[PDB]
Amino acid sequence: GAMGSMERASLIQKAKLAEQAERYEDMAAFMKGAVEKGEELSCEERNLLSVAYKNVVGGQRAAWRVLSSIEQKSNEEEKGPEVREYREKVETELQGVCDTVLGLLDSHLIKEAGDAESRVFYLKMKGDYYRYLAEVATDKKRIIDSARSAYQEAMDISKKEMPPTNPIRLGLALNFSVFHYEIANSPEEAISLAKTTFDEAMADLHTLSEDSYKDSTLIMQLLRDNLTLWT
Amino acid sequence: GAMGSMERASLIQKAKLAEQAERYEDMAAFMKGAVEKGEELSCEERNLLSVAYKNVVGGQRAAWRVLSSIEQKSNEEEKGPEVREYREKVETELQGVCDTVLGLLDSHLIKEAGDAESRVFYLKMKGDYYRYLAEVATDKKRIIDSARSAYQEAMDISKKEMPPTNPIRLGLALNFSVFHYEIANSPEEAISLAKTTFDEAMADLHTLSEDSYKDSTLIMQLLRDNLTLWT
Amino acid sequence: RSLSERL
Amino acid sequence: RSLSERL
Numbered sequence A, B: 001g002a003m004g005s006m007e008r009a010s011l012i013q014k015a016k017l018a019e020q021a022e023r024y025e026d027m028a029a030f031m032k033g034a035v036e037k038g039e040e041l042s043c044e045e046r047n048l049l050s051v052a053y054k055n056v057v058g059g060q061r062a063a064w065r066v067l068s069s070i071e072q073k074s075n076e077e078e079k080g081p082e083v084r085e086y087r088e089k090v091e092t093e094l095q096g097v098c099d100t101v102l103g104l105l106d107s108h109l110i111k112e113a114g115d116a117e118s119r120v121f122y123l124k125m126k127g128d129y130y131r132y133l134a135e136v137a138t139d140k141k142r143i144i145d146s147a148r149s150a151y152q153e154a155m156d157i158s159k160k161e162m163p164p165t166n167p168i169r170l171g172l173a174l175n176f177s178v179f180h181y182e183i184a185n186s187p188e189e190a191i192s193l194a195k196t197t198f199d200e201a202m203a204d205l206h207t208l209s210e211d212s213y214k215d216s217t218l219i220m221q222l223l224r225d226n227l228t229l230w231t
Numbered sequence C, D: 001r002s003l004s005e006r007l
Ligand SMILES: N=C(N)c1cc(-c2ccccc2)c(CCN)s1
Pocket: A019, A043, A044, A047, A048, A051, C007
């Protein structure tokens, strides 16, 4: 890879600089290079990896949605193949990013992750990137089941090994609830999961410091916001 | 070029789609392909070309400024070569975009542009992209003189061939005033140009339709905003 | 669209 | 920074 000649520490330093400069494609390339050094990632490094790819794929998803909407309107005056071609171009690039992330998780981040905080983080990421693949899939059943399977494994570990206010556990439950509502056609499961997650976190807030309380309640508010949209 | 096999009209269609999707790198690549077909550009097509590259270089300039600031602070604890290396990386990419645009203008947009609206537009663009090169140059005198020369040729044509409210003429004068203030160390020239431009446009507004009045006054407000910052 | 986890 | 032309 083009980052093979750069020191691991330099790649991490440059990923942080790229984040400050809002250069997320660069940030993702630096973090991919860091992962490919073969060492496990610290908590901060895992978050840099996630931030970088979330921003890259987030721009692709937003663009794909704009183009898919234009395409669907065209299929209700004939303008030729260009809308489909360009939607396909963006779609293929998005799928490539997702495959890259899934490849890093499979070779070899997940298999080396033994602590709950790292293993849950990576399995959640695996669910997330299969979910993004599912958003554009039309194959689709297998992709959905791969997302579900990853989220379910992450949920099982998180419930055994983490308190209900843990921000990773909360963000996992949040994203699995989104999977149920938006991907799996299971709005009742999404609502049930969001409610139970919110309520169990509420009951554990008393154990937290001021700073941890702030971290956990920020994510709980997203569960609440979705429940307001869904009910 | 990778766009050589795509129809001119399809490239223009896809540039418009890319703009809607906020995919400005794609938009610029499509418009470069359109220019390379060898035909002159319409008013709408010139604006697509400008929008695409302005957004691409604008992101690069914003990132370069963040990195240059970090670098300057480091040179006031020693952290190694990484900040300089990454600033240089972004700088080189920015210079490459500017050279690409300047290359399209030189081969062969400017030489085929005979009408004032197209010739002024392209000469202004030439001034703008040399100005962006000047922002990172440390060579620098020649780059500054190339920007000045392009803007001056555009100004001479615009004053002879366009009314003082013409939006191209106004945007040219605006950007040349920015050149004087930010690049050429000539704040008095910048203030004089902005004031004279604003006043001559004010006196010509009575000739305009409601829609043209809106177009011209929007740009005049930027002249006024700069005058408020500069005085 | 439903809200997913933030950074 | 000074304001330049908008799109
Ligand atoms: N640079 C970023 N975007 C983030 C960096 C960290 C971090 C984690 C452990 C120790 C120090 C920093 C984040 C934690 C999650 N909020 S996020």
